[PDB]
Design a protein around this nucleic acid. Structure first.
Ligand SMILES: [Mg+2]
Ligand SMILES: [Mg+2]
Ligand SMILES: [Mg+2]
Ligand SMILES: [Mg+2]
Ligand SMILES: [Mg+2]
Ligand SMILES: [Mg+2]
Ligand SMILES: [Mg+2]
Ligand SMILES: [Mg+2]
Ligand SMILES: [Mg+2]
Ligand SMILES: [Mg+2]
Ligand SMILES: [Mg+2]
Ligand SMILES: [Mg+2]
Ligand SMILES: [Mg+2]
Ligand SMILES: [Mg+2]
Ligand SMILES: [Mg+2]
Ligand SMILES: [Mg+2]
Ligand SMILES: [Mg+2]
Ligand SMILES: [Mg+2]
Ligand SMILES: [Mg+2]
Ligand SMILES: [Mg+2]
Ligand SMILES: [Mg+2]
Ligand SMILES: [Mg+2]
Ligand SMILES: [Mg+2]
Ligand SMILES: [Mg+2]
Ligand SMILES: [Mg+2]
Ligand SMILES: [Mg+2]
Ligand SMILES: [Mg+2]
Ligand SMILES: [Mg+2]
Ligand SMILES: [Mg+2]
Ligand SMILES: [Mg+2]
Ligand SMILES: [Mg+2]
Ligand SMILES: [Mg+2]
Ligand SMILES: [Mg+2]
Ligand SMILES: [Mg+2]
Ligand SMILES: [Mg+2]
Ligand SMILES: [Mg+2]
Ligand SMILES: [Mg+2]
Ligand SMILES: [Mg+2]
Ligand SMILES: [Mg+2]
Ligand SMILES: [Mg+2]
Ligand SMILES: [Mg+2]
Ligand SMILES: [Mg+2]
Ligand SMILES: [Mg+2]
Ligand SMILES: [Mg+2]
Ligand SMILES: [Mg+2]
Ligand SMILES: [Mg+2]
Ligand SMILES: [Mg+2]
Ligand SMILES: [Mg+2]
Ligand SMILES: [Mg+2]
Ligand SMILES: [Mg+2]
Ligand SMILES: [Mg+2]
Ligand SMILES: [Mg+2]
Ligand SMILES: [Mg+2]
Ligand SMILES: [Mg+2]
Ligand SMILES: [Mg+2]
Ligand SMILES: [Mg+2]
Ligand SMILES: [Mg+2]
Ligand SMILES: [Mg+2]
Ligand SMILES: [Mg+2]
Ligand SMILES: [Mg+2]
Ligand SMILES: [Mg+2]
Ligand SMILES: [Mg+2]
Ligand SMILES: [Mg+2]
Ligand SMILES: [Mg+2]
Ligand SMILES: [Mg+2]
Ligand SMILES: [Mg+2]
Ligand SMILES: [Mg+2]
Ligand SMILES: [Mg+2]
Ligand SMILES: [Mg+2]
Ligand SMILES: [Mg+2]
Ligand SMILES: [Mg+2]
Ligand SMILES: [Mg+2]
Ligand SMILES: [Mg+2]
Ligand SMILES: [Mg+2]
Ligand SMILES: [Mg+2]
Ligand SMILES: [Mg+2]
Ligand SMILES: [Mg+2]
Ligand SMILES: [Mg+2]
Ligand SMILES: [Mg+2]
Ligand SMILES: [Mg+2]
Ligand SMILES: [Mg+2]
Ligand SMILES: [Mg+2]
Ligand SMILES: [Mg+2]
Ligand SMILES: [Mg+2]
Ligand SMILES: [Mg+2]
Ligand SMILES: [Mg+2]
Ligand SMILES: [Mg+2]
Ligand SMILES: [Mg+2]
Ligand SMILES: [Mg+2]
Ligand SMILES: [Mg+2]
Ligand SMILES: [Mg+2]
Ligand SMILES: [Mg+2]
Ligand SMILES: [Mg+2]
Ligand SMILES: [Mg+2]
Ligand SMILES: [Mg+2]
Ligand SMILES: [Mg+2]
Ligand SMILES: [Mg+2]
Ligand SMILES: [Mg+2]
Ligand SMILES: [Mg+2]
Ligand SMILES: [Mg+2]
Ligand SMILES: [Mg+2]
Ligand SMILES: [Mg+2]
Ligand SMILES: [Mg+2]
Ligand SMILES: [Mg+2]
Ligand SMILES: [Mg+2]
Ligand SMILES: [Mg+2]
Lengths: 134, 130
RNA sequence: GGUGCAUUAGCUAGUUGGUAGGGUAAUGGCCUACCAAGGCAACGAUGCAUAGCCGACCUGAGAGGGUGAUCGGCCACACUGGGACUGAGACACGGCCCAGACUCCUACGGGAGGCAGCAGUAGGGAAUCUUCCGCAAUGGACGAAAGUCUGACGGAGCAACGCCGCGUGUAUGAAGAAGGUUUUCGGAUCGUAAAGUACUGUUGUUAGAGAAGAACAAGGAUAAGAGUAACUGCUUGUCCCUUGACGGUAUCUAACCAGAAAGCCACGGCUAACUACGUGCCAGCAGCCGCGGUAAUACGUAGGUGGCAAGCGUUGUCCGGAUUUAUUGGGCGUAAAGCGCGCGCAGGCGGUCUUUUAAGUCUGAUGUGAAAGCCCCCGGCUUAACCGGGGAGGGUCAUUGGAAACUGGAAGACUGGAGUGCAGAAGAGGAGAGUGGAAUUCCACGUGUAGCGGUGAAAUGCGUAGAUAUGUGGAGGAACACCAGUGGCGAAGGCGACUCUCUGGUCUGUAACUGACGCUGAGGCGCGAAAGCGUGGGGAGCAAACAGGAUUAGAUACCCUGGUAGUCCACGCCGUAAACGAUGAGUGCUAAGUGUUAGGGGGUUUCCGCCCCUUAGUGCUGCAGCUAACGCAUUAAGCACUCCGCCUGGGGA
RNA sequence: UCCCGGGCCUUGUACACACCGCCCGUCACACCACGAGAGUUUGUAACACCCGAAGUCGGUAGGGUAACCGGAGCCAGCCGCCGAAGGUGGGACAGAUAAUUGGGGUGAAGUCGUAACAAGGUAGCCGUAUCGGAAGGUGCGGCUGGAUCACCUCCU
RNA sequence: GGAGGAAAAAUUCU
RNA sequence: UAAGGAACUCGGCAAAAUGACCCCGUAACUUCGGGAGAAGGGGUGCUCUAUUAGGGUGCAAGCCCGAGAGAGCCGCAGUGAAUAGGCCCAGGCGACUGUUUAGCAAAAACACAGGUCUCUGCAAAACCGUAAGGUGACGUAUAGGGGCUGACGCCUGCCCGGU
């Protein structure tokens, strides 16, 4: 546009939304309100566990979980690794990262930071899955 | 209409692209100054001032090198009615890394980049030509 | 000078100004009485939401974008709200009074408290430290001084949290120890890597020497000054004596030791680095392309290799890449993107020349832009991190002196732009009234008899109560055959029979007249196909809805027979379209060839006619140039400038 | 000229698995987000009245009182203005929740049709009115972003 | 080749 | 009439409560007129400034009208007696004003402005009367009679075999 059109109204950017909203806020019990504080990991309480099916063309079953966070958010997380020691009413630590296979899952579970256990018989990539040196 | 200097530059640009040899247009003081400058740096070959009882006209002969090479390869307008540009003595630019020239109107008249930087004076830049 | 929203348009009344007065250190509706109705706001008032501000930090080629951790400067607060006293200075963190919530004591009358000070506890969190030493140094408060106080400060402890530095050995050691991994089972690989061999102690262990940070203050002598009648004392200068939490700390000296010291991620492409086994769309991997169904360099493991290193990976936030808001640095024919069009307020921009002004513009000098930080040059720590000195950078900053090309202001001058005048031309431009012929339908009457109409085939339907057909007459409504032509007019929608009345615009010819009077134009006002709405008429054809007959497996359709609203008129709404050239308006420049509409000039020619030149429209083919291409190309989608509108992945919408 | 099968050229295409293609909408099932909803509930900033502590200021002061010359002056006490908190009232704004309801979106083989892409078998699309289980049909006006185009007329 | 006007034919399905 | 305040009852029936003048302030909805006296609040006595500030009247004399402010004074209480709206939220019916069973029912019933159908060309149709004579009408289809519906807003679908 012309310079006069630019001085009359200036340019504007585009507001880009985040990918992991549940990590971007906390809860105040005194005010019973929600505040904008960004955190790398959070902790929550499990409600149910199960295994759902992916979209085409994949068909293998995947381990997921449903969690109430510190702010009472219904969050569907993914369980990595082989085997797990998770069940209802368990304390879990949720971490960023979404998987394309499941249309709703957007978060991962850290293995070895809370009630969650590590992975047995792991030699490679041992820093993740929370297995100590054998 | 609005800008006569831009019309000047566009006239030379069109005639240069067409490989025309002669160009004529109505005259003024600043037009004569620009033509005289271009003749001094040899971009054009010759310029004449023909007297007609409306305003007078200026006629410039475009200069081409051996084997039909264009001496003038581009003209760009810097200062515009919608956005004026003023340059300080230490902010005057070098056109085409010293290969071209710029025209600047300072308090001592119209000069080129070399003259403006030699006297440490500034003005408003009119155009680049290379 | 530094933020988001107009899906936040009015706000305000001690408010706005004045006349007197009170009050304060001081001016001031700061407060009072009187008088007038003012004041702010599309240059965003008022309101809602978020937020301490800056030097600065991260990123970036830069312009810019994000943030306000540590340190320095300013501001606000001290459990919540209000108030005053003392004082030079407070409406006062560890001062006072009142009310409020909470904690505690009570003999039930009543009292005490405020860690957002240094440590420390509980709770919230994914997440953050000792209930340590000393006034030795620097600085504070008190005092004449010694001296007291100082959780300021100087130090020690914890946490790989970050930057910098060093080590886990060094040389030699072979067709190649032994053993893993594979093998085309001859071999290759780990690999000079080992053992052996010769050497060192940076670290480490043992035993010892061991700084700077310290200047002092005060006390005793002195020497010289001012003051004095004389001293005492005072100011300066020179000596004597004394002072360490850190701390036996840094550092240094000797003896022993290869011994006590390496892990993480990755290896299909992006991207550096492959083999075997196991599994078989399962287990699973994953930032994307996507891998897994029996020969997996992508899943798990083993061997090997690559990167980094006391660190390595994962996640969260910011900048870059992203020209993906494009001033630097993008666009709108067909991919998202030109309002349906016009009249025009504010605003933006503006033909030529002269004189004058210095508002913009350019430049010199003065003051200032604290320290720390980036940068340059020097140094100090064994180097580095770190620390010190000097310098440089950074402003549309205030005072002031200069120049007058350009933009702006004033006074003049001129026609190219613009408009008027004078002479011609063309046209379905608009509104009102009247009239004309062809044809369809209906009605009446003569002639005449058995079918007519319709379809791919039929049937519904009309007809012996006499159709269809033909001839004569009458009634009424709507549309205007030939002319008719990528012809004409209008801003767009749009405008075709004829005559009259009232009116708008355009083109050419002249150079008479005025002398920049111009372009664009947010918000406003108006016009705007068809369908639709309200009131009153009119209704011949056609025809949404509707009914019947057909087709079809079904046929809420296409086809046939009828048919209401509507199509028409007047007044008033509505305000939309593939309202399209899918192309905003204004101006100028840039090869040609050939039709046509309305004019003008010249030459041939007695005229006619033919030829050439030119203005304004309307078609086609094509050069340079532009485009992703199709294509556009003097009626640009080419080359330039002014102004407006609009675009930023698809769906949801 | 016609019937049938081929071959070449040309044209339209939303097909490339290449028309045994592609592709639209309703209905039934599950899940998700959002709007409406008689109501309920939580909070924010104001406003208008009532009452109004501490405190400054102003007025009296019969009671008390050493400095000044019984008097002055001063204080206790009482009264008045302003005044935090509290109470009452009608509005404004913001969030949560609620029987039920409306369209929307996703979901390896559900049911019903075939609306669009070739002239898609009635050309398609846009505005509007009406009708229908659904895609959609029909009327009026406009466009070519339309295949074929016997015959007739202009342009290159 | 481009533009304008304009006749006659027509069953359903794959 | 102590304390309570609809617990009475078919039902707040009856009673109680508000009530005047001046000032502030006022919602959803709407046919833009309303709702509205919405709701909710504040002030009223006497004395002195004071034969007021100012007005009407008149030549003047004089006579009437009387708001704001200040200072005070007195009671439990100042429109000190009588007279003088209670208000709000939501739904059904009827648009509204009006009419009705003298003597049991006042309404959701009738009427109403508006809509539609149908008859009537003037000695009109319709109605009273045996007729004459009249109303309609001293009117003339924008007029007159009859049936149904009942402001206003959006609409009013299918069936003509039977009567
Ligand atoms: Mg892996
Ligand atoms: Mg700044
Ligand atoms: Mg900032
Ligand atoms: Mg004063
Ligand atoms: Mg804050
Ligand atoms: Mg830093
Ligand atoms: Mg960049
Ligand atoms: Mg910072
Ligand atoms: Mg801090
Ligand atoms: Mg600071
Ligand atoms: Mg505090
Ligand atoms: Mg606290
Ligand atoms: Mg004081
Ligand atoms: Mg203090
Ligand atoms: Mg404290
Ligand atoms: Mg503390
Ligand atoms: Mg704790
Ligand atoms: Mg000290
Ligand atoms: Mg000291
Ligand atoms: Mg102490
Ligand atoms: Mg400290
Ligand atoms: Mg310290
Ligand atoms: Mg830490
Ligand atoms: Mg470190
Ligand atoms: Mg290191
Ligand atoms: Mg070792
Ligand atoms: Mg060794
Ligand atoms: Mg060795
Ligand atoms: Mg082996
Ligand atoms: Mg070795
Ligand atoms: Mg020893
Ligand atoms: Mg020792
Ligand atoms: Mg030692
Ligand atoms: Mg001395
Ligand atoms: Mg001395
Ligand atoms: Mg000494
Ligand atoms: Mg001594
Ligand atoms: Mg001593
Ligand atoms: Mg000391
Ligand atoms: Mg010690
Ligand atoms: Mg010690
Ligand atoms: Mg040592
Ligand atoms: Mg030894
Ligand atoms: Mg030893
Ligand atoms: Mg050792
Ligand atoms: Mg050794
Ligand atoms: Mg060793
Ligand atoms: Mg180690
Ligand atoms: Mg692998
Ligand atoms: Mg390995
Ligand atoms: Mg390695
Ligand atoms: Mg950028
Ligand atoms: Mg740009
Ligand atoms: Mg773009
Ligand atoms: Mg454009
Ligand atoms: Mg488009
Ligand atoms: Mg247009
Ligand atoms: Mg459009
Ligand atoms: Mg327009
Ligand atoms: Mg203007
Ligand atoms: Mg000018
Ligand atoms: Mg500095
Ligand atoms: Mg600092
Ligand atoms: Mg050095
Ligand atoms: Mg430094
Ligand atoms: Mg330095
Ligand atoms: Mg320095
Ligand atoms: Mg510098
Ligand atoms: Mg001049
Ligand atoms: Mg002219
Ligand atoms: Mg006949
Ligand atoms: Mg003149
Ligand atoms: Mg407009
Ligand atoms: Mg119409
Ligand atoms: Mg109508
Ligand atoms: Mg039909
Ligand atoms: Mg539109
Ligand atoms: Mg358009
Ligand atoms: Mg243009
Ligand atoms: Mg032309
Ligand atoms: Mg062309
Ligand atoms: Mg283009
Ligand atoms: Mg063939
Ligand atoms: Mg052949
Ligand atoms: Mg072929
Ligand atoms: Mg083709
Ligand atoms: Mg139909
Ligand atoms: Mg059109
Ligand atoms: Mg054609
Ligand atoms: Mg009682
Ligand atoms: Mg009582
Ligand atoms: Mg009750
Ligand atoms: Mg009872
Ligand atoms: Mg009861
Ligand atoms: Mg009663
Ligand atoms: Mg009411
Ligand atoms: Mg009393
Ligand atoms: Mg009634
Ligand atoms: Mg009765
Ligand atoms: Mg009665
Ligand atoms: Mg009679
Ligand atoms: Mg009569
Ligand atoms: Mg009725
Ligand atoms: Mg009916
Ligand atoms: Mg019948
Ligand atoms: Mg019948």
């Amino acid at each position: 546009p012309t310079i006069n059109q630019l001085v009359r109204k200036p340019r504007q950017s585009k507001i880009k939304k985040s990918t992991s909203p549940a990590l971007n806020k906390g809860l105040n019990s005194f005010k019973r309100e929600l505040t904008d504080v960004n955190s790398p990991q959070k902790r929550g309480v499990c409600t149910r566990v199960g295994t759902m099916t992916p979209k085409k063309p994949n068909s293998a079953l995947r381990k997921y979980a449903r969690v109430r966070l510190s702010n009472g958010i219904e969050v569907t997380a993914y369980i990595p690794g082989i085997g797990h020691n998770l069940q209802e009413h368990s304390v879990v630590l949720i971490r960023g990262g979404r998987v394309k296979d499941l249309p709703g899952v957007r978060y991962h579970i850290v293995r070895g930071a809370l009630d969650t256990a590590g992975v047995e018989n792991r030699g490679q990539s041992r820093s993740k899955y929370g297995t100590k040196k054998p | 209409m609005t800008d006569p200097i831009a019309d000047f530059l566009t006239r030379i640009r069109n005639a240069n692209m067409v490989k025309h040899d002669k160009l004529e247009l109505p005259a003024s003081k600043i037009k004569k100054e620009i033509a005289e400058i271009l003749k001094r740096e040899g971009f054009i070959r010759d310029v004449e001032y023909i007297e007609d009882d409306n305003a007078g006209t200026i006629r410039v002969f475009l200069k081409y090198g051996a084997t039909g090479e264009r001496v003038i390869t581009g003209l760009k307008r810097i200062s515009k009615p919608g956005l004026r540009v003023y340059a300080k003595s230490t902010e005057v630019p070098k056109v085409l890394n010293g290969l071209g020239i710029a025209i600047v109107s300072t308090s001592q008249g119209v000069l080129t980049d070399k003259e403006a930087r030699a006297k440490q004076v500034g003005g408003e830049v009119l155009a680049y030509v290379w």
